[PDB]
Amino acid sequence: LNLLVIVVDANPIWWGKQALKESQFTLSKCIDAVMVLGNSHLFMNRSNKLAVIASHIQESRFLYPGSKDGKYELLTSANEVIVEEIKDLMTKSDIKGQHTETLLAGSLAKALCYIHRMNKEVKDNQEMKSRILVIKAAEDSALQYMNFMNVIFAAQKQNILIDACVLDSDSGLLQQACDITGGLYLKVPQMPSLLQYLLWVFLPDQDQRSQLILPPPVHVDYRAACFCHRNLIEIGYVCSVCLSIFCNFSPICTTCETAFKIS
Amino acid sequence: QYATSQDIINSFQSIRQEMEAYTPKLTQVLSSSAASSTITALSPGGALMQGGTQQAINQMVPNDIQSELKHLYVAVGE
Amino acid sequence: GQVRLGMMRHLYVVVDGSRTMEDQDLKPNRLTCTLKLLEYFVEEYFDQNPISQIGIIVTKSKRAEKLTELSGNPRKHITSLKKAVDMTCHGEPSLYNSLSIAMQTLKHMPGHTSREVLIIFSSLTTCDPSNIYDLIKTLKAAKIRVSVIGLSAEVRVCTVLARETGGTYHVILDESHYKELLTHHVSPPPASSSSECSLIRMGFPQHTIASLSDQDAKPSFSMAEPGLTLGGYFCPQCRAKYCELPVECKICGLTLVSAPHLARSYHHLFPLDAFQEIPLEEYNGERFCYGCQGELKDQHVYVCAVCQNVFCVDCDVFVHDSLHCCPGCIH
Amino acid sequence: RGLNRVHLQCRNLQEFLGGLSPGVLDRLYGHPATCLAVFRELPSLAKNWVMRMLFLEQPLPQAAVALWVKKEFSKAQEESTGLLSGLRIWHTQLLPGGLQGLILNPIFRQNLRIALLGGARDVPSLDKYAEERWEVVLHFMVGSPSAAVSQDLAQLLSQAGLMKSTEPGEPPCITSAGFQFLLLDTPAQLWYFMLQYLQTAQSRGMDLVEILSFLFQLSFSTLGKDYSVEGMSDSLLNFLQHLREFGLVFQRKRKSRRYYPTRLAINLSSGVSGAGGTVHQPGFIVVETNYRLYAYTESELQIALIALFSEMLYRFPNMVVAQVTRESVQQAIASGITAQQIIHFLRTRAHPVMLKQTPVLPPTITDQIRLWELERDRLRFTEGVLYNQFLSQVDFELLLAHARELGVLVFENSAKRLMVVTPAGHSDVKRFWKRQ
Ligand SMILES: [Zn+2]
Ligand SMILES: [Zn+2]
Ligand SMILES: [Zn+2]
Ligand SMILES: [Zn+2]
Known part of the structure; x- marks a missing residue:
């Protein structure tokens, strides 16, 4: 019994720029590699479970949740509902300007509580191990860092591994998450081979991470800046009221307006 | 640096047109x-x-050599 | 609470090793259950407050024994508790000497630390060797804070100690109530009008691997049976070599922070709110859970304050215990 | 019985599929039911390796397969590799130097990818129907007056070695294989039916491939959604109505276009139903230290089974009280039952108050059972041939060495030259004596 929770960063702006790029690799092969990974995960064992979430710019709508063309039947029904759900999601869509960068904290929150309720569903004989794949293709907003760390620590407590395939750009918070929870991070060097990366690195479960020789862990930067000038710090001043990083010593603490006792 | 909000409208147009026609599974994927x-x-x-x-x-x-380094790190630690 | 909390927190656990630890009111004897829940306590306290430290005193035979010194990693403490399962629990306790050792170490921690002692105390004869109201006057003046979790009874001296030093006294019914009390003492307790609000100088050392395939590296052993360390964490004050972070600087006095360790305890400062809990059907035009997109097959519907979306019981327990934020208010 | 006794050996789908023809196997993986069914049988190493190498077109070298495993587990590793190799999954190719590449079988892989991609009766009444029909077959083996078997199934039971017909004016007896068949698990009993049914599949114009694809098509189906028959040959119709006689499939009519795969058909799997509890029926036998069996089930079948390996004292409309006497077990082994059948029988039907225990079945009771186990079966017989009173001693170890050479040594002597050789293989050494 295992539970893969794929999260696909469906930024319509990014994949729109990718489809106006007229490349080989568009959103169709992304969601198709997602579904082939999902059918492969349901295919490896009968007891496996699948859930696929799509972070849109303004909503975390889930994608998931006879045989006409020769598949296994439940794979056919799951593929039909994922296809119809992305067609209901992306085509019928909206336009706003203040909030156009994608989100990842909310979809991870839904994944965490979904794994919680599906672990309450589990009976006493069997036990559920779980992980969250994150297929990221956009640029994450900085503005939700306060939120984002929290879901990582939830996955630290709930023992959910986190994996990430980033497509275009590196992401410090997401390699940070895959460092904290014990998951895995991978930056793909060539787009259209995406599925073959997933079926060897991110398809294998927790009792095959230890068996397979995998691409090695990149060193993780624990960079830290002030809240003052945003510049890199090796020695900082941190308040004990506000609990905020200041770079240079200042009399009056700005973050919490503290009547600072001076010695 | 997200570029000018013309790209917002352009990308909304292209991805609303994109996700209408959908599901190739055998052909397009690999x-x-x-x-x-x-x-x-x-x-x-x-x-x-x-x-x-x-x-x-x-x-x-x-x-x-480990014993040497134990003596050395104790001494230099003091 | 939207109040000031004591977030750097040298807590110091004083366990009985009395004769009354061997009584079988719990399902194993009180020593074993108490020690098991302290293993859980060290686990959840280092899981939730990373800067802070713990020290463990077993109080035994009218004398006090500093069993594990004030440090900030759960390995040594849980190893010592797995050792301390095997003890004897002979004699009457001594609250004087245990508060004296805890005071002696907790004099010279800096003033912004909410210096806290947790006395898991069972017996009734509190066999001190001197006067223990001058200690309570001293510990009142030394701005320490002592909280006692009691077994089988209410004792007046522990009540005076708890209400005068600033702490809170509690007596135990069950396994579940005792877990609720230790969970109550995991969280950072709010500060009085007395504790110093200083500004501790902090250090944020980056991780450093063996630079470029050890091209002019600095091969060290460690700094607290160690192998040859190639790289790792430095210090921005003294430029030493530490394996693990966060660790108080052993030769400088700086405190070294990776800074998600400040982000691991940011939820105390902009905290949650209450969920409006309503059991009945009641106007629900949003049938599905906004948490995880599922139906509400029970009669408990929980609605947030700001966004006022819909959540079920599983999303309630998960949001309020682990994720610590409303998924709606992020959007 | 000059050979050894009939020990009922379940094949567990490895000795069945390992030991066929590889053309039969390459036709066998031509349906995705068979590929999933052979997949789940695999050990967990080979499982993860197939799911690793599935999405791949290159023959990986042998170095990476040996180099994916931690050092301590090489003794438990070569079994998975050898089991993949002998079962025609891993056919070996060559990298153009000397690296022996390994690749999954493209017939099997292509037809699994065809299986994944492009290429009214009530549920408890289905449970009741399964119980009725298969208990009718079990009562037929026991020999009740409920003998509703329609005599093709009785001929099958006689052909598989279970109910021997002797002196042909119709006594159908029970072979000792029938007694060992009775004390077995329900999925183990049905899978032993399918193995010994397809062992003689050269009789009625049957082919192994389509029947096994239909079995693995049954056991990967759902009780709720209903099926149809159109798309099946006429020999498939004969097999499906014979299967209706088994009770694994609920039809409505013989000329109908619909079948309901029964709850017996889903749990058809080469495996073990448990050691404390069964998905089929919750356990019901409380085995106390008084050697005392408390059966909470009213059924003439299971009462007859508890009569086989015990002796029974009280019968109440809810309960049967029996005592496991030494003489009862020594009667149960005189008819021929190795007493791992008995202990696994009691572990299978372990009552849910007997659970929450360290041992499903009392270990002390088992020790007592072994003590009871040693008195009736104290003679072991072997047909042999004697060598005695040789004229020398060099020819003594020469005959002994020639016996060891051709694998016909049975018993040897050290002092008085008294050897036992196989009597059927004696003529080899006897003509060797006429040659020296
Ligand atoms: Zn401040
Ligand atoms: Zn330093
Ligand atoms: Zn809200
Ligand atoms: Zn929910």
Whole structure:
């Protein structure tokens, strides 16, 4: 019994720029590699479970949740509902300007509580191990860092591994998450081979991470800046009221307006 | 640096047109040459296999040098 | 609470090793259950407050024994508790000497630390060797804070100690109530009008691997049976070599922070709110859970304050215990 | 019985599929039901390796397969590799130097990818129907007056070695294989039916491939959604109505276009139903230290089974009280039952108050059972041939060495030259004596 929770960063702006790029690799092969990974995960064992979430710019709508063309039947029904759900999601869509960068904290929150309720569903004989794949293709907003760390620590407590395939750009918070929870991070060097990366690195479960020789862990930067000038710090001043990083010593603490006792 | 909000309207147009016509499953997903190059990459002499987890050590005279370093790190610690 | 909390927190656990630890009111004897829940306590306290430290005193035979010194990693403490399962629990306790050792170490921690002692105390004869109201006057003046979790009874001296030093006294019914009390003492307790609000100088050392395949590296052993360390964490004050972070600087006095360790305890400062809990059907035009997109097959519907979306019981327990934020208010 | 006794050996789908023809196997993986069914049988190493190498077109070298495993587990590793190799999954190819490449079988892989991609009766009444029909077959083996078997199934039971017909004016007896068949698990009993049914599949114009694809098509189906028959040959119709006689499939009519795969058909799997509890029926036998069996089930079948390996004292409309006497077990082994059948029988039907225990079945009771186990079966018989009173001693070890050479040594002597050789293989050494 295992539970893969794929999260696909469906930024319509990014994949729109990718489809106006007229490349080989568009959103169709992304969601198709997602579904082939999902059918492969349901295919490896009968007891496996699948859930696929799509972070849109303004909503975390889930994608998931006879045989006409020769598949296994439940794979056919799951593929039909994922296809119809992305067609209901992306085509019928909206336009706003203040909030156009994608989100990842909310979809991870839904994944965490979904794994919680599906672990309450589990009976006493069997036990559920779980992980969250994150297929990221956009640029994450900085503005939700306060939120984002929290879901990582939830996955630290709930023992959910986190994996990430980033497509275009590196992401410090997401390699940070895959460092904290014990998951895995991978930056793909060539787009259209995406599925073959997933079926060897991110398809294998927790009792095959230890068996397979995998691409090695990149060193993780624990960079830290002030809240003052945003510049890199090796020695900082941190308040004990506000609990905020200041770079240079200042009399009056700005973050919490503290009547600072001076010695 | 997200660019000018003209790109917002352009991308909304292109992805509303994109996700209407959908579901090729056999044809579009993988060319086999891309899969062969991916197996070439994930093989131990290619890209994404960083030639990492090597950790070449110098375990030649372990024990008495470890005792020397215990004396030295205690002394310099004091 | 939207109040000031004591977030750097040298807590110091004083366990009985009395004769009354061997009584079988719990399902194993009180020593074993108490020690098991302290293993859980060290686990959840280091899981939730990373800067802070713990020290463990077993109080035994009218004398006090500093069993594990004030440090900030759960390995040594849980190893010592797995050792301390095997003890004897002979004699009467001594609250004087245990508060004296805890005071002696907790004099010279800096003033912004909410210096806290947790006395898991069972017996009734509190066999001190001197006067223990001058200690309570001293510990009142030394701005320490002592909280006692009691077994089988209410004792007046522990009540005076708890209400005068500033702490809170509690007596135990069950396994579940005792877990609720230790969970109550995991969270950072709010500060009085007395504790110093200083500005501790902090250090944020980056991780440093063996630079470029050890091209002119600095091969060290460690700094607290160690191997040859190639790289790792430095210090921005003294430029030493530490394996693990966060660790108080052993030769400088700086405190070294990776800074998600400040982000691991940011939820105390902009905290949650209450969920409006309503059991009945009641106007629900949003049938599905906004948490995880599922139907509400029970009669408990929980609605947030700001966004006022819909959540079920599983999303309630998960949001209020682990995720610590409303998924709606992020959007 | 000059050979050894009939020990009922379940094949567990490895000795069945390992030991066929590889053309039969390459036709066998031509349906995705068979590929999933052979997949789940695999050990967990081979499981993860197939799911690793599935999305791949290159023959990986042998070095990576041996180099994916931590050092301590090489003794438990070569079994998975050898089991993949002998079962025609891993056919070996060559990298153009000397690296022996390994690749999954493209017939099997292509037809699994065809299986994944492009290429009214009530549920408890289905449970009741399964119980009725298969208990009718079990009562037929026991020999009740409920003998509703329609005599093709009785001929099958006689052909598989279970109910021997002797002196042909119709006594159908029970072979000792029938007694060992009775004390077995329900999925183990049905899978032993399918193995010994397809062992003689050269009789009625049957082919192994389509029947096994239909079995693995049954056991990967759902009780709720209903099926149809159109798309099946006429020999498939004969097999499906014979299967209706088994009770694994609920039809409505013989000329109908619909079948309901029964709850017996889903749990058809080469495996073990448990050691404390069964998905089929919750356990019901409380085995106390008084050697005392408390059966909470009213059924003439299971009462007859508890009569086989015990002796029974009280019968109440809810309960049967029996005592496991030494003489009862020594009667149960005189008819021929190795007493791992008995202990696994009691572990299978372990009552849910007997659970929450360290041992499903009392270990002390088992020790007592072994003590009871040693008195009736104290003679072991072997047909042999004697060598005695030789004229020398060099020819003594020469005959002994020639016996060891051709694998016909049975018993040897050290002092008085008294050897036992196989009597059927004696003529080899006897003509060797006429040659020296
Ligand atoms: Zn401040
Ligand atoms: Zn320093
Ligand atoms: Zn809200
Ligand atoms: Zn929910």
